[PDB]
Amino acid sequence: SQTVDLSCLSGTTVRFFGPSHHFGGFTPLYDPAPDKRVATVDAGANALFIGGGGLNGQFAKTLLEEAEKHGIRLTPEELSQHSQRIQQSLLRRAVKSPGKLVESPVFARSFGFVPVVPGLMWEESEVGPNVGVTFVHILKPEVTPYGNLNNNVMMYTVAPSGAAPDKTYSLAYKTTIAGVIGAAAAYNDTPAGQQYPVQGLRLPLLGGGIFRRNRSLESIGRANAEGTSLAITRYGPNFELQYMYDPSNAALHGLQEAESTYLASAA
Ligand SMILES: Nc1ncnc2c1ncn2[C@@H]1O[C@H](COP(=O)(O)OP(=O)(O)OC[C@H]2O[C@@H](O)[C@H](O)[C@@H]2O)[C@@H](O)[C@H]1O
């Protein structure tokens, strides 16, 4: 990988992952011997379950394998239903106190956050249900990857559908990223976060797989760059960002373009 500090993100340290040893070169969700606590952000489903395909399926696989090792009987069906029930409950609570962080075989503690009520500032029919909601979970020791205490936090976010018009998509995407950064920043100011502070985020290109439909990866990369810059302005460059490997390099390209633009802003 390569790590650089980006001025367009207020000096934030960003780690861009290259291809891994694994099939398809995908970046692992968690490392065996991390020297800091990095929370990986699940590209969640609108229905709020952990399961399915893509990145969400890898979160499911990771939790299930660890449960199996510890003799915990937990099927993919049980994990999907349970995670959905928990996150549905958090969404209900979060929508009743919007803009506030609200607070099991797998979860020790769970948090929810919506920057704004979904569907209130955009069309649900255009971007999709529950867009912008973010959850933070502390994992129980028994399902923590590698039994390492620095791997005990995950996040879960719902991205907008790429089919949406550009104006509403940009708004929805900026809001989603604000929810990710905001939820983590708020988490670190809770009692739970004092004990287990998040020191980095490991990010996919949110909305960039099955959700993007006909939308170009480059437009999403631009949305991510703008959203990330604004979110860091709002909440501060508290922790480092890591972008998981993407052969399109969409997130990288967006930030490169933003960085060069930032250099020229006073000329
Ligand atoms: N097995 C994997 N391991 C690591 N990274 C992956 C994997 N599969 C996909 N990715 C990367 O994660 C990024 C996120 O893509 P998606 O997971 O498709 O996210 P999104 O398109 O927003 O939709 C997610 C949807 O897929 C389902 O798994 C889940 O139920 C959710 O509804 C993609 O850019 C892709 O490169």
List keywords for this structure.
phosphoprotein; binds adenosine-5-diphosphoribose; alpha/beta; membrane; 8-stranded mixed β-sheet; 267 residues; Leucine Aminopeptidase, subunit E, domain 1
Query: Order of helices and strands, N to C?
Result: EEEHHEHEEHHEHEH
Residues in helix, %: 25-40%
Q: What composes the largest sheet?
A: 8 strands, mixed
Cα distance spanning the termini: 32 Å
Number of domains: 1
Strand arrangement, major sheet: 1-2-8-7-3-6-5-4
> Architecture, CATH level 2?
3-Layer(aba) Sandwich
Q: What's the CATH H-level homologous superfamily?
A: Leucine Aminopeptidase, subunit E, domain 1
CATH fold assignment: Leucine Aminopeptidase, subunit E, domain 1
* Tally of DSSP helical segments: 7
The number of distinct β-strands equals: 8
Return the CATH class.
Alpha Beta
Organism: Toxoplasma gondii
Protein name: Mitochondrial association factor 1 form b1
GO cellular component, one term: symbiont-containing vacuole membrane
Keywords: Membrane, Phosphoprotein, Signal, Tachyzoite, Transmembrane, Transmembrane helix
Characterise the protein shown here.
The radius of gyration is 17 Å and the shape is globular. Strands 1-2-8-7-3-6-5-4 form an eight-stranded mixed beta sheet, with helices on both faces. β7, α6 and β8 form a beta-alpha-beta unit. 48% of the residues are buried. It contains seven helices and eight strands, in the order βββααβαββααβαβα. The protein has 267 residues and is an alpha/beta fold. The chain has a single domain, classed as Leucine Aminopeptidase, subunit E, domain 1. The protein binds adenosine-5-diphosphoribose. The site of adenosine-5-diphosphoribose (APR) has 23 residues, from α1. Its main location: membrane. It is a single-pass type I membrane protein. Keywords: Membrane, Phosphoprotein, Signal, Tachyzoite, Transmembrane, Transmembrane helix.
